[PDB]
Structure formats: C-alpha cells, structure tokens
Amino acid sequence: GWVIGVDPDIGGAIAVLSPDGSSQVFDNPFVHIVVSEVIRKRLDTKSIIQLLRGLDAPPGTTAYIEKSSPFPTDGKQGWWSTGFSYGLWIASLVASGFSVVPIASQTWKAYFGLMRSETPKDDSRQAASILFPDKDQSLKLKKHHGRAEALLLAAYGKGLVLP
Amino acid sequence: GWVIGVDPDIGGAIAVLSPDGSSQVFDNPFVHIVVSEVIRKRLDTKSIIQLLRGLDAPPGTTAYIEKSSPFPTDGKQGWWSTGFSYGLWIASLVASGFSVVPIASQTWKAYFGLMRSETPKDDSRQAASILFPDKDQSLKLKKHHGRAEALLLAAYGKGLVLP
DNA sequence: CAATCGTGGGAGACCTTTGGTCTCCCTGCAGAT
DNA sequence: ATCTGCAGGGTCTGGCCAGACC
DNA sequence: CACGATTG
Ligand SMILES: [Mn+2]
Ligand SMILES: [Mn+2]
Ligand SMILES: [Mn+2]
Ligand SMILES: [Mn+2]
Numbered sequence: 001g002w003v004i005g006v007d008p009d010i011g012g013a014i015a016v017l018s019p020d021g022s023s024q025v026f027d028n029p030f031v032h033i034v035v036s037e038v039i040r041k042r043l044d045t046k047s048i049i050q051l052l053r054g055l056d057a058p059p060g061t062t063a064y065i066e067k068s069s070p071f072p073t074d075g076k077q078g079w080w081s082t083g084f085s086y087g088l089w090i091a092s093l094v095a096s097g098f099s100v101v102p103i104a105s106q107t108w109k110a111y112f113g114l115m116r117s118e119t120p121k122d123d124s125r126q127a128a129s130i131l132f133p134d135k136d137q138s139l140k141l142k143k144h145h146g147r148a149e150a151l152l153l154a155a156y157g158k159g160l161v162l163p
Numbered sequence: 164g165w166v167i168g169v170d171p172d173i174g175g176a177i178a179v180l181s182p183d184g185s186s187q188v189f190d191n192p193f194v195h196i197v198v199s200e201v202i203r204k205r206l207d208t209k210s211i212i213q214l215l216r217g218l219d220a221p222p223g224t225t226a227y228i229e230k231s232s233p234f235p236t237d238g239k240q241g242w243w244s245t246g247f248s249y250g251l252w253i254a255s256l257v258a259s260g261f262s263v264v265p266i267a268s269q270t271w272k273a274y275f276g277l278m279r280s281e282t283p284k285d286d287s288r289q290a291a292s293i294l295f296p297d298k299d300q301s302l303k304l305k306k307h308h309g310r311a312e313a314l315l316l317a318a319y320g321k322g323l324v325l326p
Numbered sequence: 327c328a329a330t331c332g333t334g335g336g337a338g339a340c341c342t343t344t345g346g347t348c349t350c351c352c353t354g355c356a357g358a359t
Numbered sequence: 360a361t362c363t364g365c366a367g368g369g370t371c372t373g374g375c376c377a378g379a380c381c
Numbered sequence: 382c383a384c385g386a387t388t389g
Contacts, residue, residue, distance in 0.1 A: 072370090106371060
C-alpha cells in the first residue's frame with residue numbers, strides 16, 4: 001500500500017501514498033549556486049536524502065520516477081540537468097532502501113487520458129485534485145504542476161483510477 | 164588520514180587512501196542497458212552504493228570528485244551522461260556519510276604539473292604509478308587512466324607530492 | 327511571489343581580481359591491430 | 360579484449376511504423 | 382525540460 005512518485009526536475013516534487021489512503025507531497029529541495037558567474041538552481045542533495053530518511057515508507061517501497069527523455073531541440077544545459085536530476089534522485093532513492101521503477105511520461109499520461117492536451121500542466125493539476133482531493137489546496141497555483149505529476153506517478157504505480 | 168577520490172565517468176574509478184599509506188582503487192560499476200534500440204553503458208547505481216558502504220573509511224571522510232565541465236563542442240548526450248554520472252556519484256557519496264568536495268580538473272593537474280601535455284592520459288598513469296607503486300600493475304593499460312585520475316584526485320586531497 | 331515567453335546556451339582557476347587569459351572533461355559509435 | 364579515430368548524436372510506447380512526450 | 386529574461 002506504500003507507493004512513492006517522483007517528478008525529478010527543479011520544480012518537481014516527491015509524493016508518498018500510504019496504505020490508509022492518505023498522501024503527502026513535498027516540493028523538490030533546491031539551492032542557488034554560482035555557475036559561470038551567473039546564478040543557477042540545483043537540487044539540494046542533502047535535503048533530498050534527509051527528506052527520504054524521515055519518510056514512514058518502509059524499505060522495499062517502490063519509487064516511480066519519470067523517465068529521463070529530453071528533447072533534441074533542448075539545449076545541452078537542459079540535457080545535463082535532466083541527467084543530473086535523474087541520477088541524483090535515483091541514487092538517493094536506492095540508498096534510502098527504495099526500489100526504483102522508471103516510468104515514461106507517455107505511460108501515465110495515456111493511463112489518465114492526458115495525451116495531446118492543449119493545457120497539459122493544468123490538466124495534471126486537475127486530475128491529481130480529483131484523485132487526491134485533500135491536496136486540492138496544494139494544487140491551485142500554476143507552479144504546482146510538479147506536485148501533480150509526482151502525485152499522478154504514484155497514483156499510476158498504485159493503480160488508482162479517475163471517476 | 165582517509166581520503167576518497169572519484170573519477171565519475173563511465174570508465175572512471177574510485178580511489179580510497181588509508182592512514183597507513185595503503186590504497187585501493189575500484190573501477191566504476193556499470194551495466195549495459197537499451198536506449199533507443201542501441202546498447203549504452205550506464206553507471207550501476209546499486210553496486211556503487213554497496214561499494215561505498217563496504218569501505219572502511221569512517222563517516223565524514225572527504226570525497227574529492229572531479230567537477231562537471233563538459234565542453235560546448237561535446238554532444239547533448241555527453242552533457243547528459245556527465246550530469247547523470249555527477250549526480251549519481253554525489254548523491255551516493257552524501258548518503259553514505261562522506262562529505263563531497265568538487266575539484267576542477269585544472270586544479271589537480273596544475274598541482275601535479277600535468278597541464279598542457281600531448282599525452283595527458285599516459286602522464287596521469289605514470290604520475291599515479293609513482294605516487295602509488297603498489298598500483299603499478301593496475302595501471303599498465305591505456306584504459307586504466309580512470310584508475311589513475313581517481314588516485315590523483317585522492318592524492319591531491321591528501322597533499323601528497325611527487326618525488 | 328507568480329506567471330509568461332522564447333530559445334536551447336560552458337565552466338573554471340589563476341594572473342597578478344575588478345576583466346583578461348588560458349585551460350580542462352567526456353560520449354557514442356565504428357573499425358582495426 | 361584493447362586500442363584508435365572522429366564527430367557530437369532523442370527517446371519512448373503501443374503496436375518498423377507512428378506518434379507521443381520532457 | 383533549462384535558462385535568462387519580463388510582466389504585474
Ligand atoms: Mn516531469
Ligand atoms: Mn515536472
Ligand atoms: Mn575525469
Ligand atoms: Mn576519467
């Protein structure tokens with residue numbers, strides 16, 4: 001009954017579903033660092049691992065993480081950060097005792113009927129609100145689509161269905 | 164007394180130096196996976212974690228990892244893998260109780276006088292053989308330059324000097 | 327703070343800082359000795 | 360196996376093609 | 382997706 005979902009990008013989130021139906025969602029911790037004399041956001045390694053140590057999810061809990069698949073038209077910094085966020089999350093999840101199952105974005109979108117949307121991030125927040133109504137106040141901003149994708153990944157791995 | 168050096172690429176290595184002067188060097192564990200219907204080498208996350216947790220180095224031991232600096236002329240997959248390997252190693256080292264200090268490749272090269280070499284991989288192997296003569300049999304192949312790079316990073320953090 | 331937009335990008339360490347100069351790692355294939 | 364050369368590249372799923380996505 | 386802006 002324990003399922004973890006991870007949206008790994010810099011505005012992403014981690015969702016935890018418990019066997020009693022309750023859910024948690026945490027924004028991905030980040031820090032500001034200096035790269036090439038400008039400011040960049042990067043995931044906070046220590047806060048991520050400290051977040052995972054304090055979860056009540058037992059070892060062997062499956063973590064469903066979105067498969068890294070950046071676009072060819074994305075720049076090389078987008079490719080680096082997609083890879084960096086992917087490896088940092090996977091290593092943190094494996095070291096915390098969790099079994100990592102990568103899920104393509106096409107898989108959970110087709111599962112919830114979210115393919116070919118004009119507003120995919122808004123539809124994600126709507127679908128996660130319907131699946132997790134106690135998280136509806138945590139999904140009202142446009143920036144909360146990372147929270148929704150983490151919830152939908154965990155909802156996919158748990159086998160929940162929309163009404 | 165205890166210093167760890169990490170060369171994070173797919174042919175890289177991790178070197179561990181003990182306060183009695185002895186040394187160990189392990190090739191980076193990897194697996195073959197399928198990406199876009201071809202075979203790719205990716206770092207073996209679970210084997211890296213259990214390698215770090217089998218070390219006798221106490222928690223708080225500083226792990227010097229080569230700083231990520233892919234070239235602008237490198238392709239977007241090289242940027243992805245450089246980022247992925249960097250984040251996978253950093254999260255693995257932090258979760259195992261080690262403190263991570265990134266070191267630019269120019270830093271330990273200048274400290275050992277290896278800059279502007281026409282055969283830099285050969286020179287790293289010869290420099291590591293002189294610093295760690297019980298690893299001379301483990302540095303005889305050209306592919307062993309990742310073992311040398313990890314040994315030299317660890318030698319930089321320990322303050323060793325060449326004769 | 328929160329949202330929107332347009333394009334896809336290096337980064338780093340000294341030298342003798344206040345910018346300039348110069349340096350450095352790879353991946354992913356194919357083929358050959 | 361081990362080394363060399365060279366240019367810098369998507370990847371995925373639902374069934375080689377088609378069409379989808381961060 | 383990232384990055385480096387601009388918008389109120
Ligand atoms: Mn995502
Ligand atoms: Mn996201
Ligand atoms: Mn290296
Ligand atoms: Mn290397």
